[PDB]
Amino acid sequence: AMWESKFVKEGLTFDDVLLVPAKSDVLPREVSVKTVLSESLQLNIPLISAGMDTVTEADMAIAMARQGGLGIIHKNMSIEQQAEQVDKVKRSESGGIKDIEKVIEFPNSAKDKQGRLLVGAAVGVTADAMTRIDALVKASVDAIVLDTAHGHSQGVIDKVKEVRAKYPSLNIIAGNVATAEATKALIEAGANVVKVGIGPGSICTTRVVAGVGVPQLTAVYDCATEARKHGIPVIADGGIKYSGDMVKALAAGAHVVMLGSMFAGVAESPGETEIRQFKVVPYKGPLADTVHQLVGGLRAGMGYCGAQDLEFLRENAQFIRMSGAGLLE
Amino acid sequence: AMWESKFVKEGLTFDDVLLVPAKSDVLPREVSVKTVLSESLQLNIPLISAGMDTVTEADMAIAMARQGGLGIIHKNMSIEQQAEQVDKVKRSESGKDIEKVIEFPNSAKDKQGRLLVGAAVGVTADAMTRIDALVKASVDAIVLDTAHGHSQGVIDKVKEVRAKYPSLNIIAGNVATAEATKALIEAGANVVKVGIGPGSCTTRVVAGVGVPQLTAVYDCATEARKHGIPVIADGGIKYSGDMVKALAAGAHVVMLGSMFAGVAESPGETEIYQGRQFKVVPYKGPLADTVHQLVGGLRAGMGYCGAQDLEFLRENAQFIRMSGAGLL
Amino acid sequence: SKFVKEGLTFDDVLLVPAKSDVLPREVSVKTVLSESLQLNIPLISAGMDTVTEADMAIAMARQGGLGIIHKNMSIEQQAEQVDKVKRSESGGIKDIEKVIEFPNSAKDKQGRLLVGAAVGVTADAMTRIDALVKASVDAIVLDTAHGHSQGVIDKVKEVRAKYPSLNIIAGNVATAEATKALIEAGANVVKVGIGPGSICTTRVVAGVGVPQLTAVYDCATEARKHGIPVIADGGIKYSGDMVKALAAGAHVVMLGSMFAGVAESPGETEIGRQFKVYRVPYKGPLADTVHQLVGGLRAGMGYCGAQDLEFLRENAQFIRMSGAGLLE
Amino acid sequence: KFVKEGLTFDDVLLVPAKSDVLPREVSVKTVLSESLQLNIPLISAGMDTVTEADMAIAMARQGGLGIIHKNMSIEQQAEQVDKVKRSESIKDIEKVIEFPNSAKDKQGRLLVGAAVGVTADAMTRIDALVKASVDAIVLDTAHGHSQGVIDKVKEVRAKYPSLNIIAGNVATAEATKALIEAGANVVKVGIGPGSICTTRVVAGVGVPQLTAVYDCATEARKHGIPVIADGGIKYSGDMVKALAAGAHVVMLGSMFAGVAESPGETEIGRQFKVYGRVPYKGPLADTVHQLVGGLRAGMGYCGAQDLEFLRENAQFIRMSGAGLLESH
């Protein structure tokens, strides 16, 4: 019964487990932190910036792709401004080799068919949704995220199916889900990238009010096991304590983790600067100065596990559970 | 062997689990918060105000009755003064009674358009003589609460009430065992209040007894359902997220006590010192804004789980255990 | 994998309420350790200098428990304390009021107040025991932190032989094999409690320790099937652990620290506010502390339908709480 | 991937077994190899802030093992690992008498160790040490995920087959064989050994010591090889636990951060070792025997005459995660 087999089911967070070290002939220099989400969406680092208005504008989106990651423009702005941001990220020096100057010192840039760097944009389910997407695709966007707090509402699985039949070339990133059965629902709907983030962090703290949610580690693990039957990558929204948890997330079966908070202090994020230092997280600095901490930490984490790439990381991953007594320290 | 088998019983409270979502066609607005306790005892929201001295009198009950819930008028004053308060919540509406229906659409009344009201009665020697006045004031639910919750003493006075005049709804508590929940049902109980031990009632520090509430609710609700009997969960409800768990654990309604303390509709004088008012404790204010909050978020939880009514919620209720670092 | 076994304390469990036919009046909280060792309350004062001397032994007896005279004193001076207790109540006409004054007082066949003693485990021990039985002391203890000590067993073998009719309380143990070895030494009463890290540092420096619910159950099981009672040493914070310890199989609960600042403690008094010196503030009479415990014991067994302690530990039903139980 | 359990030191308590042993009898004398016979199961960590030549002298005086730290030139390296060798021969009778428990070589010269890196430089460093009659070297690093360690060990082993190469640092069974079959007669156990460990996130990997120690000591004992605990130990109880878990010797640094012999300056009315300012902890002999006592005390309750006695005979239980600090 669905009233008998419920209670015993156990959940798990990132902090509750540790990755078991392996015989490593692999070094952080050698390791590959690249993941393929699509032909269009070829990332060189497993990171995406959230589509938050306090996280990613055009100033922020460019910085991510310059490194090799991905920027998701926020939907909390007029389409005119929104459609411009995407193409502004697309027009910086993107789509041409003419500016070798920009090619000269951003080694691991992630790019599309035209050699343009990759940018994504958030699209709401608010009633005039398609018009907000027609401007972005024609702004040559590479991806859009149809996400709500109702991240698995029929309406949010609706405007996914209403787009795939409409658009051949658009990569639909869907979310958020918490279960493997909810992963399939998005994928069958027309989702080539699935996002896991129900009660991920404080982004949708419905645990205290709605009382709903699934522990992120298991949420990442379960969904990834289902999305692999279609070769579809998953996005690890929230749950991350530090970059050591990136190592735990990318081993559960994830291709990319997406972050918001860690971008609250960088200069490329929206927020009037002030010399003490705070925006309108106080300050963090250049995005290039924060990224290598995330990457370096992941490099050694898989250099510890003998993972050359992110694929072998998942196939040959074993965890070990910590007791609830002395885990905080 | 109650010596070599006792140890393995593991318990759980609401703050140890989470409700797993479902493929939801259902959304908050559509869902129905309505809940039925009996023939004359039926609500529109799964909320009752506890029978405490600082929480519920005629003032609180009227608001609760109109908001769709129920109030339980305490047993610590004159019988006539408990009779004076009941009918006051009864003669609020009496059927060309028109204006108040527009005031709030969720009103919970009887078959004669009269707002429902409950009341606790002590289980002492002069109980039935105090219930005596309550049944004349047409109270819709009597509560048999005592420092002794399930013990034989409380079961005695359910047999006496039901055997003599069986018109009224007998609510009795508290139980924690399925065996205990059923025993009152056989006595004459129609709705059962569940809750022995909150984890900080306060009967675990210097008594060492009790049952974790989440398990206590499930264990009682499962057994009571064998007789088609509804149950009330009493205690363990920390916030808005735990009500949904309590409601998914099997409970029909969720009775809250201290949550309605500083609420404006609580009995007692009002004292102002700061800006925010205070009670003779933070003046919460109009009961609605808290109740609306308690149900406006409840719709989200059910919408997440894809339930249009409290029915679907329990049949397909799925939980997930909070691990070690998840507790923190 | 020799790590799997789980050890519980009283902080790890609760008692599940049972069907009760017992009111707080009906229970007998009387307890027997031996034919010459019977008590009216399941309490013992620890054999410490901050805890028990003559007056504490008198007071504890006058409440129904047993006082264990501590051995940090001369051989003559320990016999002196024993003397006072035995000559406390004649059994005649002069001391009848005390019988009226304290109904629950525990005594021997000749109406003399029961008193326990305590000795070391050296060559000097017998010469101390000499003076103790000379003034007719009832119980004797040879207690330290050591668990399966070979030294204590050697003494019990020597003490029981010299005095076949004497209540030897050895301790402390936390294993069945050790408890089995003590009964195999001639003892008839067992102290149980090795390394409760909640209070002492046995676990910190030695790494050795046993959680006090596991130790009690493991020892009470081994001792019971040979007609032997046990005592739970260390790990009781209030009435809660006490009831849990008694249901775990323990006949008596020995307390020292909690009793340390009581009026009958050997500690001196000085002021403002009252305090007990040589540090602990002042509480009051031992009687208040006792009926803060025993009264709660009547409440604990009451929710369980037990009318006697035998009824309790036989039909005890433990529930194992969850991780976030007290935290929330 | 997730049901696998890992235990720390705070997870375990040692359970008292047949105490047929007493501290006047028990031996903490531990062996690593024929040329490495220790009298106390401790090893100083080769760190800038832990071991100098002076510290290597005092450590061995009690029968431990001082590993000279790497962060110096090869010149001043071998100068330090030669001072300890010619610190005493029996030429000075009292200087031999004053420290009877001392650990020594064939000529009665103090036992020494030298911290050596993986790299191309190391052979020149190692050879300079073997010229200074070094007893052992440690080829350990957190940079061990470059298998150069394994490459170096055998490389060094081929050249020096009578050398006491200490390899590390591992925490799994399959990596143990990799080190052992590489020629490492001593294998270091531990990944994540910080007083606070941040490598589990900053670097990104780690495993609880008790699990690490026990598991690595399983395959290491199947083919006769002793394991060693690195850091990870805070109290004397932590010593007894992992030792019983199949370990022969424990390594510490931070705990002995501000000793007299430890590198650092003594400043001031209180004394502080500016080694980051660590208060004075006394002579090494003092800060050591506050452990060995508790170590001898832990084996007593278990009833072990030695560590092999302890390793074989000891068994473990598990505490509860619900309360640990609050229940203390």
Residue D216 annotated as lining a ligand binding site = no
CA distance B273 to chain C (A): 32
Residue B35 in contact with residue B46, Cβ under 8 Å? Answer: yes
- By what technique were these coordinates determined? X-ray
Residue B40 in contact with residue B322, Cβ under 8 Å? Answer: no
Using CA atoms, how far residue A185 sits from A211, B316, D44, in Å, is 23, 19, 59
CATH number of the domain encompassing residue A108? 3.20.20.70
Spatial separation of the C-alpha atoms in residues C313 and D6, rounded to whole Å: 35
Those residues whose C-beta lies under 8 Å from the C-beta of residue B203, and which sit 6 or more positions away, are B196, B197, B209, B210, C299, C303
Q: Is A104 on the interface with B (CB under 8 A)?
A: no
Sign of the alpha-carbon torsion through D165, D214, B327, A210: positive
Q: Is B328 on the interface with A (CB under 8 A)?
A: yes
Those residues whose C-beta lies under 8 Å from the C-beta of residue C168, and which sit 6 or more positions away, are C139, C140, C142, C156, C159, C160, C186, C187, C188, C189
Instruction: Choose, out of C26, C311, C322, the residue to mutate when testing the contact with B (most B CBs < 10 Å).
Output: C322
Cα A94 from chain centroid (whole Å): 22
Spatial separation of the C-alpha atoms in residues B175 and B79, rounded to whole Å: 26
DSSP state of D110: B
β-partners of residue D167 are D139, D187
Q: Which residue has the tokens 């790990």?
A: C235
Among B300, B315, B326, select the one facing A13 at the smallest CB separation: B326
What's the alpha-carbon Rg for chain C, to the nearest Å?
19
Cα B141 from chain centroid (whole Å): 12
Asked if A317 and D1 come within 8 Å (Cβ–Cβ), the reply is: yes
Closest C-alpha to A27, from D189, D228, D47, D141: D141
Nearest CA in chain A to B244: A211
Asked if D235 and C204 come within 8 Å (Cβ–Cβ), the reply is: yes
Asked if A319 and D201 come within 8 Å (Cβ–Cβ), the reply is: no
Closest C-alpha to A219, from A152, A301, A143: A152
Other CB atoms within 10 Å distance of the CB of residue C38: 16
Residues belonging to chain D: 328
Q: Is D275 on the interface with C (CB under 8 A)?
A: no
What's the alpha-carbon Rg for chain A, to the nearest Å?
19
3-state SS, residue C175:
coil
* Token digits of residue B304: 């997440």
What DSSP string describes B141-201?
Answer: EEEE--SS-SSHHHHHHHHHHHHH---SEEEEEEE-SHHHHHHHHHHT-SEEEE-S-----
Those residues whose C-beta lies under 8 Å from the C-beta of residue C256, and which sit 6 or more positions away, are C45, C46, C47, C48, C50, C51, C52
Q: D197, D199, D306, D313: which is the annotated catalytic residue?
A: D197
Closest C-alpha to A56, from A41, A42, A76, A36: A76
CA distance C59 to chain D (A): 30
Q: Beta-strand (E) ranges in C101-229?
A: 139-143, 167-173, 189-192
Between strands A171-177 and A143-147, the pairing is parallel
Spatial separation of the C-alpha atoms in residues B199 and B49, rounded to whole Å: 21
Other CB atoms within 10 Å distance of the CB of residue A184: 20
Cα A22 from chain centroid (whole Å): 27
3-state SS, residue D118:
coil
Spatial separation of the C-alpha atoms in residues C170 and C159, rounded to whole Å: 11
What's the alpha-carbon Rg for chain B, to the nearest Å?
20
What DSSP string describes D207-271?
Answer: --HHHHHHHHHHHHHHTT--EEEES---SHHHHHHHHHTTEEEEEESSTTSS-SSSSSEEE----
Asked if B325 and A323 come within 8 Å (Cβ–Cβ), the reply is: no
Spatial separation of the C-alpha atoms in residues D48 and D253, rounded to whole Å: 10
Find residues 18-57 of chain C whose CB sits inside 8 Å of chain B.
18-21, 23
Residue A121 in contact with residue A72, Cβ under 8 Å? Answer: yes
Other CB atoms within 10 Å distance of the CB of residue C181: 21
Spatial separation of the C-alpha atoms in residues B183 and B180, rounded to whole Å: 5
Q: Active-site residue B220, yes or no?
A: no
Q: What is the largest CA-CA distance in chain A?
A: 66
Instruction: Choose, out of C9, C177, C184, C203, the residue to mutate when testing the contact with D (most D CBs < 10 Å).
Output: C203
- Binding residues of A, as ranges, are 147-149, 176, 197-199, 201-202, 204, 237-239, 260-261, 329
What's the alpha-carbon Rg for chain D, to the nearest Å?
19
- Give residue C315's identity as a one-letter amino acid code: N
Asked if A16 and B324 come within 8 Å (Cβ–Cβ), the reply is: yes
Residue B82: exposure state from Cβ atoms within 10 A (0-12, 13-18, ≥19) = buried
Q: Which residue has the tokens 């008094």?
A: C269
* Structural domain count of chain C: 1
Q: Is B272 on the interface with C (CB under 8 A)?
A: no
Asked if C238 and B183 come within 8 Å (Cβ–Cβ), the reply is: no
Spatial separation of the C-alpha atoms in residues D291 and D59, rounded to whole Å: 14
Closest C-alpha to A65, from A84, A43, A39, A87: A43
Residue B316 annotated as lining a ligand binding site = no
Instruction: Choose, out of C173, C199, C208, the residue to mutate when testing the contact with D (most D CBs < 10 Å).
Output: C208
Q: What angle do CA A100, A102, A107 make, to 5 degrees?
A: 100
Q: Is the peptide bond before C172 cis (omega within 30 degrees of 0)?
A: yes
CA distance B129 to chain A (A): 42
3-state SS, residue B19:
strand
Find residues 153-212 of chain A whose CB sits inside 8 Å of chain B.
153-155, 178-179, 181-182, 185, 198-199, 206-212
* Token digits of residue B316: 């397909």
Q: Is C96 on the interface with D (CB under 8 A)?
A: no
- Binding residues of A for XMP, as ranges, are 202, 204, 237, 239, 260-261
Residue B118 annotated as lining a ligand binding site = no
Chain C positions in Cβ-Cβ contact with residue D314 (cut-off 8 Å): 2
Domain coverage including residue B154: 1-328
Closest C-alpha to B77, from B63, B61, B57, B59: B57
Spatial separation of the C-alpha atoms in residues C69 and C58, rounded to whole Å: 11
Closest C-alpha to B145, from B154, B137, B132, B136: B154
Other CB atoms within 10 Å distance of the CB of residue D119: 13
Q: Beta-strand (E) ranges in chain D?
A: 5-6, 12-14, 30-33, 36-38, 42-44, 66-68, 112-115, 136-139, 164-170, 186-189, 227-230, 247-252, 265-267, 272-274, 278-279, 316-318
The torsion angle over the Cα atoms of residues D191, D197, D201 and D207, rounded to 10 degrees, is 40
Closest C-alpha to D88, from D97, D77, D79, D78: D97
The torsion angle over the Cα atoms of residues B2, B7, B8 and B12, rounded to 10 degrees, is 120
Residue D190 annotated as lining a ligand binding site = yes
CA distance C213 to chain D (A): 11
Q: What angle do CA B79, B82, B84 make, to 5 degrees?
A: 110
Those residues whose C-beta lies under 8 Å from the C-beta of residue A48, and which sit 6 or more positions away, are A64, A69, A70, A71, A72, A120, A235, A256, A257, A258, A259
Those residues whose C-beta lies under 8 Å from the C-beta of residue C312, and which sit 6 or more positions away, are C246, C247, C301, C304, C306
- Give residue D170's identity as a one-letter amino acid code: V
Nearest CA in chain D to C236: D327
Between strands B35-36 and D227-230, the pairing is unpaired
Percentages (nearest 5) of helix, strand, coil residues in chain D: 30, 20, 50
Residue D38 in contact with residue D249, Cβ under 8 Å? Answer: yes
CA distance A5 to chain B (A): 8
Chain B positions in Cβ-Cβ contact with residue C319 (cut-off 8 Å): 9-11, 210-212
3-state SS, residue D319:
coil
Closest C-alpha to A254, from A240, A234, A239: A234
β-partners of residue C249 are none
Q: Is B218 on the interface with A (CB under 8 A)?
A: yes
What DSSP string describes D190-202?
Answer: -SS--SS--TTTT
H helical segments located in B47-78: 58-67
Asked if B24 and A153 come within 8 Å (Cβ–Cβ), the reply is: yes
Which chains lie within 8 Å of chain C at 3 or more CB pairs, if any? Answer: B, D
Q: Beta-strand (E) ranges in chain B?
A: 17-19, 35-36, 42-43, 47-49, 70-73, 118-120, 141-144, 169-175, 191-194, 231-234, 253-256, 270-272, 277-279, 319-321
Those residues whose C-beta lies under 8 Å from the C-beta of residue D91, and which sit 6 or more positions away, are none
Residue C44 in contact with residue C293, Cβ under 8 Å? Answer: no
CA distance B282 to chain A (A): 21
Residue C260 in contact with residue C326, Cβ under 8 Å? Answer: no
Residues belonging to chain A: 329
Spatial separation of the C-alpha atoms in residues C56 and C47, rounded to whole Å: 11
Closest C-alpha to D322, from A241, C317, C7, C175: C7
Residue D304 in contact with residue D310, Cβ under 8 Å? Answer: yes
Spatial separation of the C-alpha atoms in residues D216 and D218, rounded to whole Å: 5
Residue B236 annotated as lining a ligand binding site = yes
Give me the half-sphere count of Cα atoms (radius 13 Å) on the Cβ side of residue B152. Answer: 10
Those residues whose C-beta lies under 8 Å from the C-beta of residue D306, and which sit 6 or more positions away, are D26, D27, D28, D29, D299
Among D4, D196, D201, select the one facing A320 at the smallest CB separation: D4
Using CA atoms, how far residue D39 sits from C125, C201, D100, in Å, is 36, 26, 10
The backbone torsions φ and ψ at residue C33, rounded to the nearest 5 degrees and listed phi first, read -115, -35
Chain B positions in Cβ-Cβ contact with residue A210 (cut-off 8 Å): 240-241, 244, 297, 300-301, 303-304
Chain A positions in Cβ-Cβ contact with residue B29 (cut-off 8 Å): none
Which chains lie within 8 Å of chain D at 3 or more CB pairs, if any? Answer: A, C
Asked if B318 and A150 come within 8 Å (Cβ–Cβ), the reply is: no
Those residues whose C-beta lies under 8 Å from the C-beta of residue B35, and which sit 6 or more positions away, are B42, B43, B44, B45, B46, B230, B252, B253, B310
Asked if C19 and B197 come within 8 Å (Cβ–Cβ), the reply is: no
Using CA atoms, how far residue C236 sits from C10, C190, C200, C212, D105, in Å, is 8, 17, 12, 9, 53
3-state SS, residue B320:
strand
Residue B197 annotated as lining a ligand binding site = yes
Asked if D14 and C148 come within 8 Å (Cβ–Cβ), the reply is: no
